[PDB]
Amino acid sequence: YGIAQYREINAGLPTIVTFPFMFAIMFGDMGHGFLMTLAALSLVLNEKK
Amino acid sequence: SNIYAPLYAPFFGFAGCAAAMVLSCLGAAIGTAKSGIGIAGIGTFKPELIMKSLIPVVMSGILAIYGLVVAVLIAGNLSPTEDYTLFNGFMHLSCGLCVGFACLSSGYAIGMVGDVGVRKYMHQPRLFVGIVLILIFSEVLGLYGMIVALILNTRGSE
Amino acid sequence: QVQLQESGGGLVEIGGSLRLSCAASGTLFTFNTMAWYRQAPGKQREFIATITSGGNTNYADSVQGRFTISRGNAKNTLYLQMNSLKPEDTAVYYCNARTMTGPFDYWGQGTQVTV
Amino acid sequence: QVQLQESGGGLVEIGGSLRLSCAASGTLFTFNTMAWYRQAPGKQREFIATITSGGNTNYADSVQGRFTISRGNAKNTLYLQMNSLKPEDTAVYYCNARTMTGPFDYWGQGTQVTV
Amino acid sequence: DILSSIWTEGLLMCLIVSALLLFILIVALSWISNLDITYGALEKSTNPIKK
Amino acid sequence: TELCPVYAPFFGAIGCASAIIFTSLGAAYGTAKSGVGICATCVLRPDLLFKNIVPVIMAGIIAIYGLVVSVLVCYSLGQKQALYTGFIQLGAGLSVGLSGLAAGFAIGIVGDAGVRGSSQQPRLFVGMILILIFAEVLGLYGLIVALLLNSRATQDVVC
Amino acid sequence: TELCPVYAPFFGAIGCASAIIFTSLGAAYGTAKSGVGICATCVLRPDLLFKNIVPVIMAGIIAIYGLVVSVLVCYSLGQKQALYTGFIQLGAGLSVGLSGLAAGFAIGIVGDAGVRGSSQQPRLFVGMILILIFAEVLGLYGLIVALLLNSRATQDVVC
Amino acid sequence: TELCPVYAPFFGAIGCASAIIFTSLGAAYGTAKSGVGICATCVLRPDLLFKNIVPVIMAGIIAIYGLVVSVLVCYSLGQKQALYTGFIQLGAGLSVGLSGLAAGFAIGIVGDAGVRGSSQQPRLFVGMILILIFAEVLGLYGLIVALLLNSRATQDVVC
Amino acid sequence: TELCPVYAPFFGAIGCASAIIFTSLGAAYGTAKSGVGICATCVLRPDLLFKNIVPVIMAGIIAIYGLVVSVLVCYSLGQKQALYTGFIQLGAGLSVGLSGLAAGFAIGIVGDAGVRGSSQQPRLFVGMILILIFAEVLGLYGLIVALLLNSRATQDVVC
Amino acid sequence: TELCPVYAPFFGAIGCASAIIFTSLGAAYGTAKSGVGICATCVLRPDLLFKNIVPVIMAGIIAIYGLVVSVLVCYSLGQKQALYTGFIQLGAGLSVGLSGLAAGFAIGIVGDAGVRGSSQQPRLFVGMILILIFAEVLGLYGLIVALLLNSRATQDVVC
């Protein structure tokens, strides 16, 4: 979105939790939540490869 | 009920309220949009004239206030508990139409002149005072519509 | 074509009981009214019982108490359960199906019951 | 398909109080009118009570002040309560549910009461 | 006191909404009618002057 | 049937609105067409800017005709009135209304051409004024008819 | 049915209005078309400016026809009048109105060509004004019929 | 069901006005197209001006047909009259009117093209005026039919 | 439901007018399209003019068809008559009128193209005049049907 | 009011016919646009015609959806039926019919463009098929709604 001004508050930290949580509050379902979690796990465990 | 206060009378009261607001928005929209094209067209050739020449878009903005006042003032007189004569119904219908088409026509004129009046104001710095004067004559057409609308409203209750 | 047929005819002992059945096929709707009619030999038809689509019933006093008319679960079906018969019940029986308006009144060929 | 069931019937001691319960199912709308009817042996059906969707009540003169009719919490549920009973009250009792226009007029199977 | 024995209020309500739906349908088909293909991007041509 | 039916004010009400609707459309068109010509021509001739403004004044007057008739009709509306009064007020509204629109189109067209040409032939300015006057009085005739009708709308009326 | 119903004045009101409306639209077109022609040619030939204004005056006269008929009809309206005098007044209004409107188109179209062409051929001016006279009387015929109808509206009417 | 209802004159009034209205649109168009043709060619050859005029006067005659029928119908109007008289003289008005309008279009188109060509082929003029006559009689037939109808409109009529 | 209601003449009057109106449109169009062709070609070969005029007089015949049917219907109008005779002679007017209009368009289009080509191929002329006749008979069939309907319209009718 | 009026079958017949009419217009347009594309490009590349023909087959299937709904509705028509059945199977007719028309337009345009482009980029063919499937199911959705409505047309209906 843009480069932050020199030493102003970095928006990154609030984004770490509030972005996926504001997604979850819409995408609320244990079924579809599990399928998405399993997909990411298969991807992160192999990250070395 | 009186035969002069049939139960369908409010239909014309609301119809006047609608005509007052919808047509005023159309008048304001034409004036703002067309002026915006002229204001932006000169931007790439000399930016500094823009912030000094938003006059047409603010003038076209005022037209929405004429519509708002009449629409608010009409809506304040309707209710489901009071009796509301058919005469009162027709007065609000005419009340709404007067301000509606007055603002629509005025907005068209403001937009048409504000477009050219900026798009070739870049060539003549001393031209500006003339543009504002013709805009005033273009603006006042809306004011006449409101003046007659207001006196229709107060006479509507009698 | 729309058509009806009865079933359950036969002969039984005095004081006995049996069930008459009727059905219709080929129709596009539930009949507003269906009824049973009886004809002893040598006489005109007698009205026995009737039942609307909503279950409202009416009976002749000659069968009041003794007979029970009922709707089936399949559309346009009837069952008439008759018990405590007497020899006067010897007759052919017809089922009749009727629409709320118009000439659409139907009759089956009928079937026989005797003591 | 719509259907109805009575309940609460049976024999009771002379002068005893009793309640009859009824329900209707299989339709999406609330019935405009619901009512109770009775039939002793050897007689035609007799009116007893009816109640509108707005809660207005009407009764037969014979049971005025003896019987009370009311609707339940949920749609299309009905109750009748009689504070004392006598031999002239013995009969089978029916529910009825109606629509403001048309042939949609439903009737229940009925239940018995005796002293 | 009826409105009419032919143009009864029941019929007019049907005609009003059906006319509105027809208007929306006609506008929609008008936009669809205007579709056309950018043939120049699908075909190919060459000349020696460019080369 | 009754001389003063309940719906009689409807015609007067629409007549009142008609007067200001069509005159404002006429004045708006006359202002727009003239304005384009004025702005276009003065870019090389800024000195005569306030001399060429006349057509805008000329077009603006047509809206005053609408306001006068609309106001005069307005103060004659009432809950109980004869149909005859309604019909005449409608006649007064349409006559000034659509006459003003006709004059507006005339002023707009000739104002554009006259201004655009006048900037490069100074003697032509008087010629433009004369033709604009002839366009102007077409609105005036509409006003005269409307005022004659309006005074007759409420004389000898029984109700 | 009554021969003097309450709605009879309505057609008279529309007859009065239409007379001035359609005539003014005719005069407006005649003025607009001619005005562009004059303002175009007189840039180079300002000396003959007052000679070339005739077509505008010609179109202006048509507006007078609409005014007099409208005024004559107006002074004959009333709350109680026959249907017959209502229909005849509408006939008077439309005839002068739409006949004058036709004359307006003819004067406009030939006025433009005549003024523009005559600037470079002086002998053509007599041709232009002679043709305009033929276009002009198409309005006059409409007036003549309108006056005859009007003179027959109130004559020998029972109510 | 009456032979002579109160609304009968309505068809008469519309018939009277229709005769002169539609005729004038035809004459106006014929004058316009011919005028532009004359003003175009006569710039180089003014000597032809006063014989090139013929299509204009030829178009002008059609307006007379509308006038005489309209005046004849006008003097036959009255408050009490049969629907039969109403229908017949509506037919009289329309037949002359819309027929004359068609003749107006013809005279305008051929008058323009013919006069445009005559200026460089003097032998063509006798041919041009010959064709104009075949266009002219189309209006004349409309007049003949109207006069027969108008004559029949007011004899053997009872009420 | 009477056999002879008072509005029966309305259909006859419309049929009578319809016969000459639409036929006039057809003949006018045929004359206009043809005339432009004749004037265009005769500039270079004026000796050919009186030979080339055939399409104009050909289109003229169409107008006569409308006239004779119009008069024959006209003389069969009366105040009291059956709806049957009304309907029939409405059909007579429409059938000749809208057939003549179709014939006029055909004569106009082909007469133009024919004459414009005949100036550089003399043997084409006998081809052109043959094709005109096949356009002509389309009008004649309309006349025949109209005369048959009219003959039937007024015999064995009761009321 | 009756549940089963005599005009009830009308909406059934309209629904039955409408199902096949609109669906055929969709399939016709899809066939036409695709056909032009195939014929235009296969002149230079005849070897791939029987691969490029798929869009025509895809458009052809849509007509089958209309047929089956039309037949299924047809066998439910009767002389005496509830008005409710008429409206339901009218809705069944429209939903598939105008969905087929929509899908037909989609297949026609992308079918033409895909075939036109595929002839000089072999990797694009799989893309064309993939897009066409999305266009195809727009018809299938219409069928599913139609069959749901149709199944509901006759159960729990009294007459």
Place this chain on the structure above:
Amino acid sequence: TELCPVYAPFFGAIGCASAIIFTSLGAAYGTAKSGVGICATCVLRPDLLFKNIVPVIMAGIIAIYGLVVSVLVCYSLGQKQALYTGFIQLGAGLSVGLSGLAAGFAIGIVGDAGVRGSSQQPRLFVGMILILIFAEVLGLYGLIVALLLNSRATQDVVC
């Protein structure tokens, strides 16, 4: 008089049908516009074909909104129902249909541009996706209102 007249189901049937019809037309237009864009650009850049189909699947999504509302509405139809239930599910049909129609048009027009631009400014792809999704929800806002109205369709209704 009565809350549950015989014609009440008509609004339900047409509401159910229009939900899928208008949504299908919108999805078809969205597929057609973007489909040509994909075929146009992939000729030179086949490698990004499967990245560019996103506008097509997004257009496909809109059709599913129409289907589910049509299914949810359909299960409420019955022979005997109040006008209340009739109109409330017509509102559901109109709101989703008119919303999906607009969303389909927008996705088509902006997807067409996005696919072309993305072929030569690779950063531009994320810009396309952001804009398209804000177009997608315009269908969803229609679905939500449809669901809200439908949730109320049979609540507390007396009949």
Place this chain on the structure above:
Amino acid sequence: SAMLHSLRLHWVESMSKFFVGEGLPYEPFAFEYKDMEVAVA
């Protein structure tokens, strides 16, 4: 669809309350491998 609505709420609704932006990115001089294919392209 849901994921990029979460993005919208952050960039526009949430972040505009404090974020000034228009800063200068840190871009140090350094060496890396260059693809011959991308270079000729």
Place this chain on the structure above:
Amino acid sequence: MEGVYFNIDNGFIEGVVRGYRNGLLSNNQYINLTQCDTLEDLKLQLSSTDYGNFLSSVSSESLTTSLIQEYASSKLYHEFNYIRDQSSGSTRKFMDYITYGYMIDNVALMITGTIHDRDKGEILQRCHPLGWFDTLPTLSVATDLESLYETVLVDTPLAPYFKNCFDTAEELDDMNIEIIRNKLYKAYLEDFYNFVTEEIPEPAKECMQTLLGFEADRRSINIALNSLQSSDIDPDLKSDLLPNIGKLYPLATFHLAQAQDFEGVRAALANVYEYRGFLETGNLEDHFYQLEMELCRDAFTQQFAISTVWAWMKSKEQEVRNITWIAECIAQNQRERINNYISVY
């Protein structure tokens, strides 16, 4: 109003073309080019502008002003064809109309090269690449215009424009070809102007009517002044070569056709304000280029108008004329005239 429907079809085009407009060289950039002193420096300087890497495949010893002219032009011709490929409908028809002018010029060039019996391989390499059509080189097979028309030209979109050409002598000539070229342009501009009037909406309608009018005027003035080099031309024959759409028409064009000498041309032209002072001073074509650029710069101030692509097309052509002029001054070292470039932006 103006903008509600334009973007349904042309929205993407309008964005890209204005993207190109932002690449036009400004006055400061011409000044920087002026300060170079070797083409090897001009290559480096240009690469900082929007022209980028366009010469990155050319060896330093191969740099010549003709090569720079060719590559700079090729840049524009690809951008034009790209935009046309993305268009459809009336916009596509409009851009083809822009193309007809170039191929009308190629026809005359090809015939001129043929009648001198020069190698067709030489002629093609100087034809304008926008004015290409499938059978262009086949015009070299004959000299008779009647034979060429039936053989080739009836099949091309130029066919309607020969309506007035065929009354020639039996064999062509340099003067005979030029009168054909002008009588083609005569028909072309009137057709183009008519199409604009019929099918292009506002404000693009008035914008193009103005721009086409200017070209008709310039076409007329040059023809008048060039005829003065002839020993004689029949004024009625000369009258056919002046388009009817110009601001000069009909009044000034009539005198301009009658005129016999430069003094008479001045007497005819002095009646029109927009050209009141053109013939007195400087170079005539220099004035025309200046005024042409003013009209283009004005057109860009509109929005949602397809005339923008005409404005971009013509403005970018002048920039190539500027760049080559500067490059020629660098190469020939005759610097004193270098400042005569034309730039409004």
Place this chain on the structure above:
Amino acid sequence: SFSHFLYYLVLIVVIVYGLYKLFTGHGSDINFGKFLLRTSPYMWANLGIALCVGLSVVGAAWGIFITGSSMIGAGVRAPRITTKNLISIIFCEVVAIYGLIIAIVFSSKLTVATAENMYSKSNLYTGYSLFWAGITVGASNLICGIAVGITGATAAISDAADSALFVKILVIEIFGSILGLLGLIVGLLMAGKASEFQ
């Protein structure tokens, strides 16, 4: 054109029918008041709610494609455009939110009336009120979406020339977006006093 011919045909037949009924003495047959007084108020209310969101969504969609197509075209040589100019899309999309919000409010009014009170004064008032209240919000939102969209496209074209211009042009979009609020405010006012169907 053929459509204009239909308009004049429809105008003429309406005039003839009105004149016909008037002269025969049946002018009171064409009674607009009794039609307006006897049609079911559920029609007006539901039709108003439907067109409210329906027209609002049309406005937003029309605004977005006006802005988006130009923004994408401008971005080809200036990709910095794509992320900052998103705000113009936001101003278009919020116009749909206002349409949704009014639908939430009005939906609460749709109770079911008893037959005895179906056509009473209060129920009729609510029926007319919701109808016109829906139209003004829908129509105003439709107009607003176009005006913001046209300005948004203009801003993106200008921003690509010089970053300094965007901030100055952005002011005009604010004035345009205010028309959304005014439509909403008048919608709530004229509906606020109506009572749910009794």
